[PDB]
Design goal:
heterotetramer, A: alpha+beta, Cyclin A, domain 1, SH3 type barrels, 2 domains, 6-stranded antiparallel beta sheet, 6 strands, 36% helix, globular, B: mainly alpha, Nitrile Hydratase, Chain A, 11 helices, 4 strands, binds cobalt (II) ion, EC 4.2.1.84 (chains A, C), nitrile hydratase activity (chains A, C), CN_hydtase_beta-like_N (chains A, C)
């Protein structure tokens, strides 16, 4: 989708706010929000591409200025409603309850070894997205290609700043989960993946740095020979 | 940035806290989230996984040309040599700063970052100020925000992590460090130097 | 500039809010904000192109959700600071004063016939932007042209959705004030102006309406023959 | 749209009111703004200039083919025939709905609108929801928001007022109105019908 969240090349967003140091987690609610990712992923709320798409559907004014882990909460609720696993009325009632009784207990529950094993395995084992496919790569290093001007309304990884621009294939990586299917719940449908080099003149015109290039990763359908 | 429409930070925190506790109560009742799962994730990224791991990789590459070769050919496989790897680093590609090229990494679409070697990204990396600007005015951004002046004649290559390939910068070894130990060299390697927003520390 | 305010083709902004009726002015402060335009324009704070640029430099999160005439206030203050006609410290003090004393009087002042005559003349006479120039038009009806991929950091009228796209010249209008100079305080520097027709396929790829076109106005430097 | 960061409408109005009164006090002291200037502008656009003026133009074009010709050739000059013209209508171009083409106007960059014939635009025209969507999904937007179904085979032409050319739609004359008076025909002409978001009123 052509969301505001695809911010590369947007002007006017202001200077970077970078404190001299910062903790990994600024508040206990951020640790909760962070750990909710393996929890909802294991539970089938969403895969990684679908998680990103939920964030992209946020109110852009809320997206631009909210704490980052709030984006994570929005996407869990999005997918919880989508899949019928979260009742919004119940969530709204519970929110007010914890607004009025912030120190009330969480619900009684049992700890589960299998959740600790799931987390350690994800963290240290990884969740690789590479896949084998039947077809060989369409493109190769040195090929000069143009990026698609398609504008899907669902999830994709087609930054507006690269669309219709011409670049050179730098590397073929093998095939991977394809976001335009996976993030829209249409499955992995893996496609070959390439890094492509675009000059700053190609991307920005004469306002580009004269000695700069951006490398962006393109799934096969995103590019064709010029 | 001033926004006359926006609540105070304290009001925003108070509302988020209630919303999160509510959602937490529901996922707890579903049996899918527990206090030990939450505590485990926080311990791993507070104390187990962080940029000290990337620093070990950098210093090995600085002191071992064959390893450096392996690291630039296949970053995941090279880092596994040191027992380093996992989530959001399943496909690492390291890129080498030289006198001719300077590299900087960004996730313009979100916040993607090479977690197994750097841990979670600092807030400024995930925010729209850095993400929007670095692909368009990288030389000015490095000067203005990081005090880092890359001369106009040196190419700046910005790597936008739109796929699960995770780019990591191998910074150039500071002058004046010949024959230093791996431990001494590590004191020079910062997360900023592996994002490409600063060079490794002088001296 | 590549601001968020250039919203054509952005997805995710949500459904239109359209009440069944509405007054022209929703509150007395909007009448003030509206009338401040001829007042600051006559006073030399800004011309029309410069007024638009001040709004484009707003915090995008504030822009997207504020009342429209608040954008006007931001641009008057922007240009008042730029030209040294508004002291921000004094403005900040006066704001707090009227926060605490909302019914306090406005300052004593004299009415001025010349301001009423200025307003009636602007409204009914117009402020035409057409200008005569020395050179004839470079382009003509039927010419197939591509829109520039330049990305100025100051004011321009180069919607990101049209940049690098190909369209056909529909009409030449004569020359007009050129925004890329005028909105950046570099003067009128008038350029010929054309309407150009872009198909929805050209703009949006296969997600475009198959039977739709967008007409967009291009100053001469914005376009070249394909 | 929900934004957990945003103050209430009442808080926002209270803050804007103070900010505006402050700026007003300064411009008053500069001698550049007065209460009668403010009142005059508000009277002109509350009561003098508005879509009843465009409606007169439409009905003349419907009942006078030579005028219609002049109106489509040079909208400013034609409208001056009726004493209609001025600010933000110095360069009007009217475009004609037919059985083959439907037109709709937008200012994607801001809010530009043909003030001398329509008065100031309604809020929804100036807001980012309509502005963003109408150049990309005009047929869906007309159906979903305005109840107006333009069959797929009919071309929709969207006019984005990026310059000081101000586009105005001449809507098609409703069936069933043969020989009606100019006054009767005017009851059918709405601002929405001259923006192109609705047809003129049936019946
Ligand atoms: Co990311
Ligand atoms: Co406008």
């Amino acid at each position: 989708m052509n969301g505001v969240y695809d911010v590369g090349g947007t002007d006017g967003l202001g200077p970077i706010n970078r404190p001299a140091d910062e903790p990994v987690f600024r508040a206990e609610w951020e640790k909760v929000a962070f750990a909710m990712f393996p929890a909802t992923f294991r539970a089938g709320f969403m895969g990684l591409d679908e998680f990103r798409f939920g964030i992209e559907q946020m109110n852009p004014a809320e997206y631009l200025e909210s704490p980052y882990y709030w984006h994570w909460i929005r996407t869990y609720i999005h997918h919880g409603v989508r899949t019928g696993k979260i009742d919004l009325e119940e969530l709204e009632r519970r929110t007010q309850y914890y607004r009025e009784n912030p120190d009330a207990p969480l619900p009684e529950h049992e700890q589960k070894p299998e959740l600790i094993e799931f987390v350690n395995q994800a963290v240290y084992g990884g969740l690789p997205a590479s896949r084998e496919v039947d077809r060989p790569p369409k493109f190769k290093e040195g090929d000069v290609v143009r990026f698609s001007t398609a504008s899907p309304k669902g999830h994709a990884r087609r930054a507006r700043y690269v669309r219709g621009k011409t670049g050179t294939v730098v590397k073929h990586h093998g095939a991977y989960i394809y976001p335009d299917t996976a993030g829209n719940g249409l499955g992995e449908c893996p496609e070959h993946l390439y890094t492509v080099r675009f000059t700053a003149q190609e991307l920005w015109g004469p306002e580009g740095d004269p000695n700069s290039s951006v490398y962006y990763d393109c799934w096969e359908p995103y590019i064709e020979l010029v | 940035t001033e926004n006359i429409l926006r609540k105070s930070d304290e009001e925003i925190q108070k509302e988020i806290t209630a919303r999160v506790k509510a959602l937490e109560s529901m996922l707890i009742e579903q049996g899918i989230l527990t206090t030990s799962m939450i505590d485990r994730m926080a311990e791993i990224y507070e104390n187990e996984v962080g940029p000290h791991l990337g620093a070990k990789v950098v210093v090995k590459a600085w002191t071992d040309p064959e390893f450096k070769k392996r690291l630039l050919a296949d970053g995941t496989e090279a880092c596994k040599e040191l027992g380093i790897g996992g989530l959001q680093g399943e496909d690492m590609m390291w890129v080498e700063n030289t006198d001719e090229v300077h590299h900087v990494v960004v996730c313009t679409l979100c916040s993607c970052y090479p977690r197994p070697v750097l841990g979670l990204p600092p807030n400024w990396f995930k925010e729209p100020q850095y993400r929007s600007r670095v692909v368009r005015e990288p030389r000015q951004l490095l000067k203005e925000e990081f005090g880092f002046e890359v001369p106009p004649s040196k190419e700046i290559k910005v790597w936008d992590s739109s796929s699960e390939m995770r780019f990591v910068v191998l910074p150039q070894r500071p002058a004046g460090t010949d024959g230093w130990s791996e431990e001494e060299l590590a004191t020079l390697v910062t997360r900023e130097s592996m994002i490409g927003v600063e060079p490794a520390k002088a001296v």
